[PDB]
Amino acid sequence: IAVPPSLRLPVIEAAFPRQLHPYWPKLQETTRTWLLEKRLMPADKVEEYADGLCYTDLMAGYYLGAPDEVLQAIADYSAWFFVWDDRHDRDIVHGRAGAWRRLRGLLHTALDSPGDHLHHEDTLVAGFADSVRRLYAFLPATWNARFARHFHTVIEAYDREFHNRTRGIVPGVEEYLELRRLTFAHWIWTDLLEPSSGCELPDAVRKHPAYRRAALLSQEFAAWYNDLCSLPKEIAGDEVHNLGISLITHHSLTLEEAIGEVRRRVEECITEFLAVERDALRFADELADGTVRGKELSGAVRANVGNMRNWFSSVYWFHHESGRYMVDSWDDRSTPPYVN
């Protein structure tokens, strides 16, 4: 309830009130069981840590209005995503370049044919395939293909991160901001707005400048606020990918100065979002031209922009609730207790 001053965003607390999807209690346990049954974490670590990681809370505060089974698929995928980030980190730390390379190729393949990988020997690949197959069942194949196109790009950004960290390369500020839109998977979360509101948006709608800019700002806030909040753990873990680190490294900023510059950029996302949110909601109003399809399109854009806004509050409170970032409570600050 009380946020550290250096992380506190009064505009979020006053103007972005938290929302919670009514399915969240069953969501929490169902994802916990999925992590167990897919063997994505040891049973000991699931029982001790899964709930305290707040992964399902993060999604349940974001995709409001989603059908229960859509939110379940999203939450399982999101938990898988955190575990994949953990495997990526461990492969880097132990120099398992071959294991990472093979996983990367398997994920590319599984992304295009998830059914063929539902029982793969690698449980991380099998869990990926199961979540992706379920996400592919909600909307037409044209949405499935866009999801895959986007996630192929994400996988390759993770590979670039692998190269950067093994070689000890800190990306430039602009290089990093470009790469961060892919490692954070901006466009996957944006894609998943549409099954949550039940509608694949035509390209002309979702590429409207107000929709695109609202969608961008929501994810930039989420990624850069994560950078601000995960900075201690990431410095502790020899992580190089973080806006603050790029600023210290290439703009010769101190730690206090870089934190302040990240904080400022986070705050600007909020007020930039508020301005373009008005345009995006005017756009939704214009889509209701009187036809049945127009009303559905209008409702779906409104829902999605609504959830772009919810992302701000969900991500904010998640970083203060989740055990994932409490580096100060670990016996080994470079080894989070929840990774294998």
Ligand X SMILES: NCCC(O)(P(=O)(O)O)P(=O)(O)O
Q: Which residues are catalytic?
A: 81-82, 184, 324
The DSSP symbol for 202 reads P
- Number of Cβ within 10 Å of residue 328's Cβ equals 9
SS3 assignment for 24-80:
HHHHHHHHHHHHHHCCCCCHHHHHHHCHHHCHHHHHHCCCCCCCHHHHHHHHHHHHH
- CA angle, corner 73, sides to 67 and 77, nearest 5? 145
CA 84 – CA 182 distance, rounded (Å):
15
CA 75 – CA 78 distance, rounded (Å):
5
Residue 166's binding partner out of Mg ion, ligand X, none, with CB under 5 to 8 Å set by partner kind: none
The DSSP symbol for 207 reads T
Those residues whose C-beta lies under 8 Å from the C-beta of residue 162, and which sit 6 or more positions away, are: 88, 91, 92, 97, 100
What is the signed CA dihedral for 23, 59, 37, 103, rounded to 10 degrees?
A: 160
Name the residue among 198, 266, 199, 268 with its Cα closest to residue 230: 266
The site for ligand X (CB under 6 A) is made up of: 82, 85, 183-184, 226, 230, 324
Half-sphere exposure of 124 (CA within 13 A, CB side): 20
**CB distance 124 to 40 below 8 Å:** yes
- 3-class SS at 117? helix
- Cα distances from 119 to residues 35, 127, 129, in angstroms, run 15, 9, 9
